[PDB]
Amino acid sequence: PVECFEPSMLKKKQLTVLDLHPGAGKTRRVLPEIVREAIKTRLRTVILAPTRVVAAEMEEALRGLPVRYMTTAVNVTHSGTEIVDLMCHATFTSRLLQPIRVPNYNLYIMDEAHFTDPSSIAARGYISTRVEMGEAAAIFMTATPPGTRDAFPDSNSPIMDTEVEVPERAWSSGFDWVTDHSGKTVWFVPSVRNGNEIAACLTKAGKRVIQLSRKTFETEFQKTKHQEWDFVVTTDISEMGANFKADRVIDSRRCLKPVILDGERVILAGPMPVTHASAAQRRGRIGRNPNKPGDEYLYGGGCAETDEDHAHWLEARMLLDNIYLQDGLIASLYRPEADKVAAIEGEFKLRTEQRKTFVELMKRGDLPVWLAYQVASAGITYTDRRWCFDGTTNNTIMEDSVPAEVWTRHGEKRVLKPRWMDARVCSDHAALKSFKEFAAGKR
């Protein structure tokens, strides 16, 4: 595997995967070395961060170098002469779908290039296709390169890996090893609700617990830096952009993931096995300090053998089939990922007007890719929300165990019952609030 950057990697037609184990200095050391060389050789460059949190960490590593930050996660003074841009994976792919002039970047740098968000998968397909066509160079950085299946990468200090029965519910006995520990534990859970139950159990046992989710990360993660705690109970939000001074990770190795059932609806299936890349990220929270040997990773089962049931792979093809490349050429998925989907290239290419609807439903509408595709390919216009109310009864959306209701643009209170059901529009309070506002015609 390639673990060291060399300037020769910046030549066109080169796609290099830098296999950088957790704690090896991917962002603090390697990324600045790449960016410095790119600037010196006058290469127009885009740096692709998986999240806003990671984008902000990159600015710290790149501080003082001329980078244009195309994210509101960073506020610095641009000189206007920067040739290096920085944006999130989703921003990049979203811009590819717009009628804009996507610059001809000579170099693409993708951090956390294992990320399986549809926009990340699609970005890797676009980038790798451009490299194969001879138009650019790319560097993909990750602890787990796409196509590899090692959940136990290297670390700065040896990690003790033990498979155990991991509790996934509150317990009154049977798991003394959880609470007998005198150190600090990061515990990964599949959902906020599940974490609430485990955190409540630990708190009743006298432990100090901080809970992390996407909603609460900004305020609560700071508390892990400045307050005493025994346990961090966190969703997958902490697989990237989050480090802890801990000596143990507990990982049930399960997650929820969207799955398309019978091509007809999307459910949040699981909890079911996490991917090797995710398990490696979770484990990678510990074993980071050479002077603190003895860290422990306690895990509850195996990783996903196939992630092909994950809806994100098909969604990535829906995005890529609708990104213009050259004379109606369609990019392929990155080769080590290409067999995760069984659709023919072009199956999801929409004609001009339906494609514009698709794009607007994802951007302004903030709908999942799969759902936006169903609506746009049905010939529905962006502002016509009648489909949110005319599904079959089994598509009724519930709020607190009663049918959810919305005041529509036409002044009628109607039960939310979309023609196509995607569990991601109502999987938590924030999602449901957002979909209600969409159904009411408020955006």
PDB file of all heavy atoms in Angstrom, residues 273-286:
ATOM      1  N   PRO A 273     -25.146  -5.015  10.223  1.00  0.00           N
ATOM      2  CA  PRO A 273     -23.691  -4.861  10.359  1.00  0.00           C
ATOM      3  C   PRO A 273     -23.158  -3.602   9.692  1.00  0.00           C
ATOM      4  O   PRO A 273     -23.526  -3.263   8.565  1.00  0.00           O
ATOM      5  CB  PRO A 273     -23.145  -6.121   9.688  1.00  0.00           C
ATOM      6  CG  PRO A 273     -24.239  -7.133   9.894  1.00  0.00           C
ATOM      7  CD  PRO A 273     -25.515  -6.356   9.741  1.00  0.00           C
ATOM      8  N   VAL A 274     -22.239  -2.940  10.395  1.00  0.00           N
ATOM      9  CA  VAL A 274     -21.503  -1.831   9.813  1.00  0.00           C
ATOM     10  C   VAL A 274     -20.510  -2.358   8.786  1.00  0.00           C
ATOM     11  O   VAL A 274     -20.142  -3.535   8.777  1.00  0.00           O
ATOM     12  CB  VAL A 274     -20.770  -1.029  10.898  1.00  0.00           C
ATOM     13  CG1 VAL A 274     -21.766  -0.516  11.947  1.00  0.00           C
ATOM     14  CG2 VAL A 274     -19.652  -1.883  11.534  1.00  0.00           C
ATOM     15  N   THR A 275     -20.020  -1.442   7.953  1.00  0.00           N
ATOM     16  CA  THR A 275     -18.980  -1.764   6.979  1.00  0.00           C
ATOM     17  C   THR A 275     -17.617  -1.883   7.655  1.00  0.00           C
ATOM     18  O   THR A 275     -17.384  -1.343   8.740  1.00  0.00           O
ATOM     19  CB  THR A 275     -18.892  -0.685   5.901  1.00  0.00           C
ATOM     20  OG1 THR A 275     -18.489   0.554   6.500  1.00  0.00           O
ATOM     21  CG2 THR A 275     -20.236  -0.503   5.214  1.00  0.00           C
ATOM     22  N   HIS A 276     -16.685  -2.553   6.962  1.00  0.00           N
ATOM     23  CA  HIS A 276     -15.309  -2.617   7.456  1.00  0.00           C
ATOM     24  C   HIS A 276     -14.724  -1.226   7.657  1.00  0.00           C
ATOM     25  O   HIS A 276     -14.014  -0.979   8.641  1.00  0.00           O
ATOM     26  CB  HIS A 276     -14.426  -3.413   6.496  1.00  0.00           C
ATOM     27  CG  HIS A 276     -14.826  -4.846   6.361  1.00  0.00           C
ATOM     28  ND1 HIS A 276     -15.715  -5.280   5.402  1.00  0.00           N
ATOM     29  CD2 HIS A 276     -14.471  -5.942   7.072  1.00  0.00           C
ATOM     30  CE1 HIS A 276     -15.883  -6.586   5.523  1.00  0.00           C
ATOM     31  NE2 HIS A 276     -15.134  -7.012   6.524  1.00  0.00           N
ATOM     32  N   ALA A 277     -14.996  -0.306   6.725  1.00  0.00           N
ATOM     33  CA  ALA A 277     -14.443   1.039   6.848  1.00  0.00           C
ATOM     34  C   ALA A 277     -14.971   1.725   8.093  1.00  0.00           C
ATOM     35  O   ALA A 277     -14.218   2.385   8.816  1.00  0.00           O
ATOM     36  CB  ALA A 277     -14.782   1.868   5.602  1.00  0.00           C
ATOM     37  N   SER A 278     -16.274   1.583   8.358  1.00  0.00           N
ATOM     38  CA  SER A 278     -16.845   2.203   9.550  1.00  0.00           C
ATOM     39  C   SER A 278     -16.278   1.589  10.824  1.00  0.00           C
ATOM     40  O   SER A 278     -15.969   2.313  11.774  1.00  0.00           O
ATOM     41  CB  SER A 278     -18.363   2.093   9.536  1.00  0.00           C
ATOM     42  OG  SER A 278     -18.914   3.079   8.674  1.00  0.00           O
ATOM     43  N   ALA A 279     -16.154   0.256  10.873  1.00  0.00           N
ATOM     44  CA  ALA A 279     -15.597  -0.392  12.058  1.00  0.00           C
ATOM     45  C   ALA A 279     -14.179   0.086  12.322  1.00  0.00           C
ATOM     46  O   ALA A 279     -13.781   0.269  13.481  1.00  0.00           O
ATOM     47  CB  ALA A 279     -15.607  -1.910  11.885  1.00  0.00           C
ATOM     48  N   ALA A 280     -13.398   0.256  11.252  1.00  0.00           N
ATOM     49  CA  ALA A 280     -12.029   0.743  11.375  1.00  0.00           C
ATOM     50  C   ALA A 280     -11.990   2.159  11.917  1.00  0.00           C
ATOM     51  O   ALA A 280     -11.119   2.484  12.732  1.00  0.00           O
ATOM     52  CB  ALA A 280     -11.328   0.680  10.014  1.00  0.00           C
ATOM     53  N   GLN A 281     -12.925   3.017  11.477  1.00  0.00           N
ATOM     54  CA  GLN A 281     -12.998   4.378  12.007  1.00  0.00           C
ATOM     55  C   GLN A 281     -13.366   4.374  13.479  1.00  0.00           C
ATOM     56  O   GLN A 281     -12.834   5.174  14.256  1.00  0.00           O
ATOM     57  CB  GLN A 281     -14.029   5.211  11.242  1.00  0.00           C
ATOM     58  CG  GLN A 281     -13.688   5.481   9.783  1.00  0.00           C
ATOM     59  CD  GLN A 281     -12.424   6.301   9.616  1.00  0.00           C
ATOM     60  OE1 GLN A 281     -11.465   5.852   8.985  1.00  0.00           O
ATOM     61  NE2 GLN A 281     -12.422   7.518  10.157  1.00  0.00           N
ATOM     62  N   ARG A 282     -14.306   3.509  13.871  1.00  0.00           N
ATOM     63  CA  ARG A 282     -14.729   3.456  15.268  1.00  0.00           C
ATOM     64  C   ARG A 282     -13.589   2.990  16.152  1.00  0.00           C
ATOM     65  O   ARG A 282     -13.261   3.630  17.158  1.00  0.00           O
ATOM     66  CB  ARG A 282     -15.932   2.525  15.408  1.00  0.00           C
ATOM     67  CG  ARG A 282     -17.174   3.044  14.675  1.00  0.00           C
ATOM     68  CD  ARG A 282     -18.338   2.081  14.802  1.00  0.00           C
ATOM     69  NE  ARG A 282     -19.525   2.625  14.149  1.00  0.00           N
ATOM     70  CZ  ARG A 282     -20.769   2.221  14.383  1.00  0.00           C
ATOM     71  NH1 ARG A 282     -21.019   1.265  15.267  1.00  0.00           N
ATOM     72  NH2 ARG A 282     -21.777   2.782  13.732  1.00  0.00           N
ATOM     73  N   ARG A 283     -12.971   1.879  15.771  1.00  0.00           N
ATOM     74  CA  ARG A 283     -11.795   1.378  16.473  1.00  0.00           C
ATOM     75  C   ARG A 283     -10.680   2.415  16.500  1.00  0.00           C
ATOM     76  O   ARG A 283      -9.968   2.533  17.501  1.00  0.00           O
ATOM     77  CB  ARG A 283     -11.329   0.092  15.799  1.00  0.00           C
ATOM     78  CG  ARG A 283     -10.049  -0.500  16.364  1.00  0.00           C
ATOM     79  CD  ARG A 283      -9.798  -1.800  15.640  1.00  0.00           C
ATOM     80  NE  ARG A 283      -8.562  -2.484  15.986  1.00  0.00           N
ATOM     81  CZ  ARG A 283      -7.391  -2.266  15.395  1.00  0.00           C
ATOM     82  NH1 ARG A 283      -7.260  -1.341  14.449  1.00  0.00           N
ATOM     83  NH2 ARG A 283      -6.341  -2.992  15.751  1.00  0.00           N
ATOM     84  N   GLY A 284     -10.521   3.184  15.414  1.00  0.00           N
ATOM     85  CA  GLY A 284      -9.446   4.159  15.305  1.00  0.00           C
ATOM     86  C   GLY A 284      -9.516   5.316  16.276  1.00  0.00           C
ATOM     87  O   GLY A 284      -8.587   6.132  16.307  1.00  0.00           O
ATOM     88  N   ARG A 285     -10.595   5.430  17.050  1.00  0.00           N
ATOM     89  CA  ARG A 285     -10.632   6.433  18.114  1.00  0.00           C
ATOM     90  C   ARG A 285      -9.633   6.136  19.222  1.00  0.00           C
ATOM     91  O   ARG A 285      -9.320   7.042  20.001  1.00  0.00           O
ATOM     92  CB  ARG A 285     -12.018   6.530  18.771  1.00  0.00           C
ATOM     93  CG  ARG A 285     -13.205   6.951  17.896  1.00  0.00           C
ATOM     94  CD  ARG A 285     -12.868   8.121  17.013  1.00  0.00           C
ATOM     95  NE  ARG A 285     -12.386   7.611  15.742  1.00  0.00           N
ATOM     96  CZ  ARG A 285     -11.423   8.157  15.008  1.00  0.00           C
ATOM     97  NH1 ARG A 285     -10.819   9.265  15.402  1.00  0.00           N
ATOM     98  NH2 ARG A 285     -11.078   7.585  13.861  1.00  0.00           N
ATOM     99  N   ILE A 286      -9.169   4.892  19.353  1.00  0.00           N
ATOM    100  CA  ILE A 286      -8.215   4.582  20.419  1.00  0.00           C
ATOM    101  C   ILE A 286      -6.945   3.987  19.821  1.00  0.00           C
ATOM    102  O   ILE A 286      -6.848   3.807  18.603  1.00  0.00           O
ATOM    103  CB  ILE A 286      -8.838   3.674  21.505  1.00  0.00           C
ATOM    104  CG1 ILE A 286      -9.598   2.474  20.919  1.00  0.00           C
ATOM    105  CG2 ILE A 286      -9.800   4.483  22.359  1.00  0.00           C
ATOM    106  CD1 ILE A 286      -8.729   1.307  20.594  1.00  0.00           C
TER     107      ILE A 286
END
